[PDB]
Write a protein that binds this ligand. Structure first.
Ligand code: L66
Length: 265
């Protein structure tokens, strides 16, 4: 674990608030004093008291992965605390929380360029992720964090039917191309301002409908360019999906759209 993750001294860490709950324990916000004396805002995942050896290894497993990534659109690991308790994973702090709950609070309040900026960031982080040989398997708006300047960063490296490609659901064929499928769903989620993919359809129907060629409809006022991008990410043949590098290239052009567009077949 300490191969990629710096051990932090707990004395350099202040806890200021409880910002939510994770699988393994409370999530908190606070501050970290760095070796250079600079103080930064951090988010802190804590491991519940009374954890088992397996929980600890799985908890900290996320940090070993996260520690190998250094990119503006991947959540930055500051370090871990294992020598004292509670055990913690400490990252940079993201003021505006999860992308999906953030967007739900601001329905139709952003410009298309702003949304594209967010989408470009996610795509760039994923381009780096796939460059490093990692498959996320859980790419979802709720796993993207967004900061006070609206910069989006991929998180949650712990590993979800609605976000999973058809072939990954069918026989666990996870590749960067199934991540690209997931990105398509995230793209829908963003243009929908945090709407749940496939709403509350039963899982079997989401599975069958998608397998039959049915796709999420264009969100309200979605530019055709962004909708077609979703459809590309959702090609049945995974070899026909664009690579993250092309997705990044596509979004950089759109950032530099007037045409505006139950599942569709
Ligand atoms: C995606 O966000 C999370 C989901 C589950 C649990 C914690 C957070 N989680 C994480 C996080 C994510 C990681 O993958 C690893 C380590 C951490 C600290 C950072 N933040 C923040 C954050 O920096 N700011 C927030 O407002 N919220 C709600 C956050 N929730 C999380």
């Amino acid at each position: 674990v300490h191969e990629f993750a710096k051990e932090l001294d707990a004395t350099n860490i202040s806890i200021d608030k409880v910002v939510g709950a994770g699988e393994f324990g409370e999530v908190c916000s606070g501050r970290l004093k760095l070796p250079s004396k600079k103080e930064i805002s951090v988010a802190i995942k804590t491991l519940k008291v009374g954890y088992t050896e397996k929980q600890r290894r799985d908890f900290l497993g996320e940090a070993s992965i996260m520690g190998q990534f250094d990119h503006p659109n991947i959540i930055r690991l500051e370090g871990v605390v294992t020598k004292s308790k509670p055990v913690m994973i400490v990252t940079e702090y993201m003021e505006n929380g999860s992308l999906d709950s953030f967007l739900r609070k601001h329905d139709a309040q952003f410009t298309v360029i702003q949304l594209v900026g967010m989408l470009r960031g996610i795509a760039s982080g994923m381009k780096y992720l796939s460059d490093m040989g990692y498959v996320h398997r859980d790419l979802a708006a709720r796993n993207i964090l967004i900061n006070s300047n609206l910069v989006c960063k991929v998180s949650d490296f712990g590993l979800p039917i609605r976000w999973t490609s058809p072939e990954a659901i069918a026989y666990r064929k996870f590749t960067s191309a199934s991540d690209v499928w997931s990105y398509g769903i995230v793209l829908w989620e963003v243009m929908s301002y945090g709407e749940r993919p496939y709403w509350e359809m039963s899982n079997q129907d989401v599975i069958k409908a998608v397998d039959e060629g049915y796709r999420l409809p264009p969100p309200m006022d979605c530019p055709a360019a962004l909708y077609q991008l979703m459809l590309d990410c959702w090609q049945k043949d995974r070899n026909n999906r664009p690579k993250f590098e092309q997705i990044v290239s596509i979004l950089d052009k759109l950032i530099r759209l007037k045409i505006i567009t139950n599942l569709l077949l």
